[PDB]
Ligand binder design. Structure first.
Ligand code: HEA
Ligand code: HEA
Ligand SMILES: CCCCCCCCCCCCCCCC(=O)OC[C@H](COP(=O)(O)OCCN)OC(=O)CCCCCCCCCCCCCCC
Ligand code: CUA
Ligand SMILES: [Cu+2]
Lengths: 102, 45, 77, 55, 236, 59, 269, 534, 47
């Protein structure tokens, strides 16, 4: 409802900037997924960087599953494909190719 | 870039089973009195 | 009734007619109880009390007049 | 990477409500078609039985 | 008439008042049915869709569009379902020359119908009881628990006034077939304009408790032609 | 007055029930209820004991 | 030490009340009274003395609770501003329920304004039914009651201001006026207006007047209780839980009496 | 046990007594209504050989116990005195002797009804006490007087409970809570307190004058003197219409609470819903004579009353849309209180819309005092009292007592009682639409199969109640063994699907009600320092 | 009133004691509940 994405986005990166442990990361991630606002690739990269800082790969698994299935978005795929591949090959967090064939 | 939907495809393929199931549920909930009426000797049958 | 007595009714615009029989009976009992010769002044609402009004009220009012304690508020004549 | 988001806030409930209203209306019409047919048949029978005895 | 077994609708209409009442009732039922179907399908689709919802949309509180939509819709819905009610009340409640007037008093577990509009031999007031035939003393072929030894008659294609009252306990003049249902106050009277256009026998019972022996309680109505009514009047 | 403070101090020192105000009245009223109400409610069901049992069965 | 006890007894205006038998005994008294009245008015025994004693002991229990509700406010104390406001609002809602009772009694006969009904009444004024009307007969008492209320409302204001010899004069005047009121009520014991045989128009007025004769008895009993309460001199011009109740009662009863006197006396006559 | 239980002065120790009285009364009333339905399965004296006065007295007892003796102590008293002071944070409610005297004034009502049914006179005038049928002219004996005293004591207890609720809410509410953030259930009970306060005195006075007429050889409303019972029936309807709102509004509050907590999302405009309940409570007084269209009053009065009814219907629909928005767009866990809430929002809504259709001024000619009106109010009574009580029990029982319940047993119980209630109450509308009378032990031979299906549904419902009391037994006897194993759910709040379960150890039970954040039930005078909200 | 742990004191029951294994009391609850309907039916008529 005529709400700017930039303000809440910048709030998200600023919150992830001081990620001392996983609690604030988790709460901010839950808040971001609470809205209908589909997260941008930039905030997803920031979240993965914070998860790397706090060293919890399962949190990365959870967020990747959430991005795979959060809202229908008219069943968009290639957007999901690019938004996953850029952050997979930016630094390397191999997790998706294991839980699926198990 | 409007990938896939085209709302109509998934919209129909998802609601049609649901509306059919709900119609069947209502049909059963209205035919159980009809089942009782049929089973009872309403017409000495 | 031979399917035709008055036709259209427009005496009282509102639907409810609880307070209708008093006015339509006081005049009838008046015109009966002064002259008794010609009923022309009250010759137009014969059915307003015979069939259009509960005859139980009519019979109770007649019995009250016989006993002298009328339901309505009228004079002694 | 589609920039336009937040458009899913309201149209889901709007389409759900309008489709529910349409389904209710068409279902009620389907039920009431037979009821109205029976009512008209009964009315026609009433007129026939009232008019046939006088003449 | 007789309550049809396994019925799920109204009984057979007998008067234009009843057919108008049924028309209003089904007109109201149409909108009520669409509303209940809407809400039921809403509930069903919610419980079917969001039962598997992983993340809750917990930051939605305003919804102005739906708010105004379902704030303005109920008003017009109520207006469009109330207008036929008012027009039917105006049509039926009209005092269009009631032609017949008889007493209907609710006594103690019995009724004493008095016919004072008409006479029997010369000026006399016709009056008779209506006692329910006991179940043990029932004659073969009768209706159980309700049939009476003698009932009241009524002309067809006329207008009838039912003067309803009681003696000691409040009763009810409830006749669903004829579309008349007026309480029987012990001391206060009321006038209801009942007009009959179709022949037949219409049943009915007092829809108000009369103490204990209220299960064996007769109100039977028989509609007759003008020659039939005259012959009955001469016989009575 | 001249007894309020002392009585309050005594009550605080001796935290006992009955509030010390009306012990004789309480001892007079306690047995009266048991003597009266029980003995007046017992007939209410004792007398209709022979009256009870009206089956009024009919066939 | 002070902080912990202040926190543990500050928001707790409720005492550690002993296993008080008041609810069970009052319930037992009411049940005994109810069954006794039911058995006596129509039953097997027509005894009257012992049911009178049961009513007497029920009234004594009620009086005991009523005197405790004001004794524990001073002797026990342990009250704050919040609980005082709670008691005041409770008394306001009791007098509001009494106002609703009076409103129902008034509506029992006040809805017949323009005669909307047809038979069995529906005639304002009821011409023809002219018995000894209870209207304008006790107005000689109503006017002096209004005068007494007007002259004692400000006396009780001065009471709550100072609680001094002027308060004593006010309370003795109140005793005198309530004694006069109960005397003139008891003088019209049997033959006040008429008895209920037929034509119930003033009998409803008589019953409505009679059923409110217990509020004045309760007020007089409370006034005597407060008189003894001040005679003990424990209740100073402090937690006057009875003085506020009596001033609000005398400030509402005059208003409701004037509301009664507005109609039913010069309306329809 | 006499030293602390029979002589209690604690809301904590009296709420459980309220609950025990409520469940005992409910089970006894269900067995007695079982008898009523069983003797009505077929026409004739299948089980009641004559004595229709006995059937009438059975009906009066059923209705009275369902209305004033079962549900009033449960959600008004039992739930109020264990939730409102707990949510406030105050140590104890103001002057608990009010609560104690309100509780202890009930049982002699039960004994007076049982002894009145025992005697040959009986009270067979219906739950309504319309004169002169309840006077000495028709019904003699002390039964009428006993019923009058029972209703008087119930009214006094309800008034005392409202007194306690009002004083606790207004005088010693916690600093953190304010007017603009007060929760829903306490607003519901406060509005119910207003309605009860403004409704009790009219019944008290009118029934007092009826008793005086029966005793003083007089008659204010009976014809013997010139009175008219229509005035008393206006007064009785003026009392009765707010009563259904009194019994339905705390149900609205608890249902709002459970749906708000089970949707994992906050409320949908709490200001709008509290305005809705306030409007319902204020508008409940404009239809004082809407239940009495049968006399034949002026058409303008009937039009005004039907306009008032259609105005009253609007806030209920808005509040229903509010629950629907609350459940929309939120995570759903199919736990049993949610099943009760869904059954409510379906069947209560259907019953209310049927009543709205019935609310027409001229439509009482075919439905009033028939089986249609009983099919109407049985719907709402079952939804807002029976199912609401079941939801509240299964929603606070694991913490208010620390004892859990078998989830499988709860699910099968809900299914059984739901299908039983549906199959019982649905055919009653088909009986009513025909025009059958009410309050008759024997009926014509037209709708026998519907009576038979109602009887079998009643047997299903009573078997469900037997299973429910067995569930109560099992919870009271095997709670410790059920907690350790997987027989029941120990966390009504599954963690969000973004968070690990190890962090969840500190996030066990988090909602918008303080008593859930409390540990196992502490001593009665808990809450040493009142809670503060920043 | 502060001498109770907060486990089973909230109900007038007692696990300890061989007089009633919560079965005599539960049967008695059934008995007192089913009293009024059956006695009401029996006092003026048959079950
Ligand atoms: C609480 C409200 C309540 C409940 C639960 C019921 C339960 C039932 N009622 Fe009744 N009834 C009334 C309120 C209620 N009723 C009222 C007010 C009247 C007015 C009298 C009149 O109209 O003159 C009435 C009258 C009435 C009549 C009128 C009889 C006649 O015409 O004279 C009939 C029969 O048709 C009937 C049937 C039933 C049936 C089959 C059930 C069955 O559902 C019984 C099975 C029980 C349930 C399925 C619910 C479980 C109940 C509980 C108590 C659960 C216990 C646990 C908790 C409470 C936590 N009821
Ligand atoms: C739980 C108790 C309860 C509740 C909640 C209700 C709620 C309602 N009741 Fe009922 N009622 C009774 C208990 C109850 N009632 C009892 C005991 C009787 C006496 C029977 C007897 O005498 O034997 C009775 C009788 C009764 C009568 C007279 C029938 C009679 O007894 O002869 C009428 C009709 O005027 C009526 C109407 C309503 C309406 C309109 C509501 C509504 O408030 C319902 C609220 C819910 C809705 C209205 C749903 C919201 C609707 C929408 C989704 C919007 C759609 C409509 C618009 C466009 C606004 N009730
Ligand atoms: C159990 C599920 C809950 C109850 C659902 C059914 C209630 C209605 C009812 O029990 O209907 C009962 C009516 C009988 O009506 P009747 O007048 O002939 O009974 C008079 C004669 N006893 O039909 C039935 O017996 C249907 C029986 C099952 C038929 C399907 C299986 C056939 C093999
Ligand atoms: Cu009747
Ligand atoms: Cu109402």
């Amino acid at each position: 409802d005529e709400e700017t994405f930039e303000e809440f986005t910048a709030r998200y990166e600023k919150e992830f900037d001081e990620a001392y442990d996983l609690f604030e990361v988790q709460r901010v991630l839950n808040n971001c997924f609470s809205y209908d606002l589909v997260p941008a690739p930039a905030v997803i990269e920031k979240a993965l960087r914070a998860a790397r800082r706090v060293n919890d790969l399962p949190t990365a698994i959870r967020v990747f599953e959430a991005l795979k299935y959060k809202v229908e978005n008219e069943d968009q795929y290639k957007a999901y494909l690019d938004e996953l591949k850029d952050v997979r090959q930016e630094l390397g967090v191999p997790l998706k190719e294991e839980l699926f064939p198990s | 870039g409007r990938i896939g939907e085209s709302w109509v495809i998934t919209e129909g393929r998802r609601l049609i089973p649901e509306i059919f199931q709900w119609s069947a549920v209502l049909s059963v909930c209205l035919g159980w009195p009809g089942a009782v009426y049929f089973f009872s000797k309403a017409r000495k049958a | 009734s031979p399917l035709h007595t008055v036709g259209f009714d427009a005496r009282f615009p509102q639907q409810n007619q609880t307070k209708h029989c008093w006015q339509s009976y006081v005049d009838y009992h008046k015109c009966v109880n002064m002259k008794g010769e010609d009923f022309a002044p009250c010759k137009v609402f014969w059915k307003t009390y015979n069939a259009l009004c509960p005859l139980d009220w009519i019979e109770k009012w007649d019995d009250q007049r016989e006993k002298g304690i009328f339901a309505g508020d009228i004079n002694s004549d | 990477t589609i920039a336009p988001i937040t458009g899913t806030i309201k149209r889901r409930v709007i389409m759900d409500i309008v489709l529910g209203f349409s389904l209710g209306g068409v279902m009620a019409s389907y039920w009431w078609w037979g009821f109205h047919m029976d009512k008209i048949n009964k009315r026609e029978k009433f007129y026939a039985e009232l008019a046939e005895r006088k003449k | 008439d007789v309550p049809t077994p396994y019925a799920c609708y109204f009984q057979d209409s007998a008067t234009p008042n009843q057919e108008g009442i049924l028309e209003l009732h089904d007109n109201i039922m149409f909108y009520l049915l669409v509303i209940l179907g809407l809400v039921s399908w809403m509930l069903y689709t919610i419980v079917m869709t969001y039962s598997k919802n992983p993340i809750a949309y917990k930051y939605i509180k305003h919804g102005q569009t739906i708010e105004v939509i379902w704030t303005i819709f109920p008003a017009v819905i109520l207006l469009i379902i109330a207008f036929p009610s008012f027009i039917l009340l105006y049509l039926c409640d009209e005092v269009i020359s009631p032609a017949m007037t008889i007493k209907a008093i609710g006594y103690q577990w019995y009724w004493k119908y008095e016919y004072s509009d008409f006479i029997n031999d010369s000026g006399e007031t016709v009056e008779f009881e209506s006692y329910v035939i006991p179940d043990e003393l029932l004659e073969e072929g009768q209706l159980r628990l309700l049939d009476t030894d003698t009932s009241m008659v009524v002309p067809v294609d006329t207008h009838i006034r039912f003067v309803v009252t009681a003696a000691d306990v409040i009763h009810d003049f409830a006749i669903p077939s004829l579309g008349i249902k007026v309480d029987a106050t012990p001391g206060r009277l009321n006038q209801v304009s009942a007009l009959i256009q179709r022949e037949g026998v219409f049943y009915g019972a007092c829809s108000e408790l009369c103490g204990t022996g209220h299960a064996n309680m007769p109100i039977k109505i028989e509609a007759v032609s003008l020659p039939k009514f005259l012959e009955w009047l001469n016989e009575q | 007055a001249n007894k309020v403070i002392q009585l309050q101090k005594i009550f605080q020192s001796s935290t006992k029930p009955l509030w010390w105000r009306h012990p004789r009245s309480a001892l007079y009223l306690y047995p009266f209820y048991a003597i009266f109400a029980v003995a007046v409610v017992t007939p209410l069901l004792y007398i209709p004991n022979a009256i009870r049992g009206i089956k009024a069965k009919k066939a | 030490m002070t902080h912990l006890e202040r926190s543990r007894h500050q928001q707790h205006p409720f005492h550690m009340v002993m296993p008080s038998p008041w609810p069970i005994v009052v319930s037992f008294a009411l049940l005994s009274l109810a069954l006794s009245t039911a058995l006596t008015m129509h039953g097997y025994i027509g005894n009257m003395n012992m049911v009178y004693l049961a009513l007497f002991v029920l009234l004594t229990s009620s009086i005991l609770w009523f005197r405790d509700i004001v004794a524990e406010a001073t002797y026990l104390g342990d009250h704050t501003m919040a609980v005082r406001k709670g008691i005041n609002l409770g008394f306001l809602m009791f007098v509001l329920s009494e106002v609703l009772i009076f409103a129902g009694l008034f509506w029992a006969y006040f809805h017949s304004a323009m005669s909307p009904d047809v038979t069995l009444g529906a005639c304002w004024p009821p011409v023809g039914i002219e018995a000894v009307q209870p209207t304008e007969l006790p107005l000689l008492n109503t006017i002096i009651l209004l005068s007494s209320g007007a002259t004692v409302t400000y006396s009780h204001h001065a009471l709550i201001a100072g609680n001094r010899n002027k308060a004593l004069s006010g309370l003795l005047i109140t005793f005198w006026l309530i004694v006069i009121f109960v005397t003139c009520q008891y003088i019209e014991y049997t033959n006040a207006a008429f008895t209920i045989s037929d034509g119930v128009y003033g009998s409803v007025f008589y019953a409505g007047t009679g059923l409110h004769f217990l509020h004045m008895v309760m007020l007089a009993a409370m006034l005597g209780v407060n008189y003894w309460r001040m005679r003990n001199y424990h209740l100073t011009a402090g937690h006057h839980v009875g003085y506020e109740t009596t001033i609000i009662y005398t400030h509402v009863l005059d208003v409701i009496w004037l509301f009664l006197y507005v109609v039913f006396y010069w309306w329809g006559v | 046990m006499v030293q602390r239980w029979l002589y209690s002065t604690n809301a904590k120790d009296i709420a459980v007594l309220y609950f025990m009285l409520a469940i005992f009364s409910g089970m006894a009333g269900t067995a007695m209504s079982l008898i009523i339905r069983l003797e009505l399965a077929a026409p004739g004296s299948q089980y009641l050989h004559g004595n229709s006065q006995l059937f009438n007295v059975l009906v009066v007892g059923h209705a009275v116990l369902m209305i004033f003796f079962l549900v009033m102590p449960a959600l008004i008293g039992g739930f109020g005195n264990y939730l409102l002071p707990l949510m406030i944070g105050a140590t104890d409610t103001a002057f608990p002797r009010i609560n104690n005297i309100a509780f202890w004034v009930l049982p002699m009502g039960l004994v007076c009804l049982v002894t009145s049914t025992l005697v040959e006179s009986g009270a067979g005038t219906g739950w309504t006490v319309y004169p002169p049928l309840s006077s000495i002219q028709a019904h003699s004996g002390p039964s009428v007087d006993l019923a009058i005293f029972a209703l008087h004591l119930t009214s006094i207890s309800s008034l005392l409970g409202a007194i306690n609720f009002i004083v606790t809410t207004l005088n010693m509410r916690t600093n953190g809570m304010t007017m603009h953030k007060l929760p829903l259930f306490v607003w519901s009970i406060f509005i119910t307190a207003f309605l009860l306060l403004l409704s009790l005195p009219v019944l008290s006075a009118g029934i007092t004058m009826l008793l005086l007429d029966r005793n003083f050889n007089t008659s204010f409303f009976e014809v013997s003197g010139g009175g008219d019972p229509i005035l008393y029936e206006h007064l009785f309807w003026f009392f009765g219409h707010p009563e259904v709102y009194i019994l339905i509004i705390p149900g609205f509050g608890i249902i709002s609470h459970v749906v708000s907590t089970y949707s994992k999302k906050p409320v949908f405009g709490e200001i709008s819903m509290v305005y809705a309940m306030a409007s319902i409570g204020l508008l409940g007084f404009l239809v004082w004579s809407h239940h009495m269209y049968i006399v034949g009053l002026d058409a303008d009065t009937r039009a005004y009353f039907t306009s008032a009814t259609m105005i009253i219907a609007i806030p209920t629909g808005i509040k229903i849309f509010s629950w629907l928005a609350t459940i929309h767009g939120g995570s759903i866990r199919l736990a049993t209180p949610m099943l009760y809430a869904i059954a409510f929002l379906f069947l209560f809504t259907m019953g209310g819309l049927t009543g709205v259709a019935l609310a027409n001024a001229s439509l009482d000619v075919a439905f009033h005092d028939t089986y249609y009106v009983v099919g109407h109010f049985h719907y709402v009574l079952s939804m807002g009292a029976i199912f609401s009580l079941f939801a509240g029990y299964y929603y606070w029982s694991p913490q208010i007592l620390g004892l859990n319940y078998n989830e499988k047993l709860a699910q099968i119980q809900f299914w059984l009682i739901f299908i039983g209630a549906n199959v019982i109450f649905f055919p009653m509308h088909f009986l009513g639409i025909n025009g059958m009378p009410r309050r008759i032990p024997d009926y014509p031979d037209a709708f026998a199969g519907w009576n038979y299906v109602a009887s079998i549904g009643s047997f299903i419902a009573t078997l469900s109640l037997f299973l429910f009391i067995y569930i109560l037994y099992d919870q009271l006897v095997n709670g410790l063994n059920n907690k350790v194993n997987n027989k029941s759910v120990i966390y009504n709040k599954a963690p969000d699907f973004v968070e690990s379960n190890t962090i969840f150890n500190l996030n066990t039970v988090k909602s918008s009600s303080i008593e859930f954040l409390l540990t196992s039930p502490p001593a009665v005078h808990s809450f040493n320092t009142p809670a503060v909200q920043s | 009133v502060h001498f109770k742990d907060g486990v089973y004191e909230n109900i007038p029951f007692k696990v300890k004691g061989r007089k009633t294994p919560y079965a005599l009391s539960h049967f008695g609850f059934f008995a007192i509940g089913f009293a009024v309907p059956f006695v009401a039916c029996y006092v003026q008529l048959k079950k």
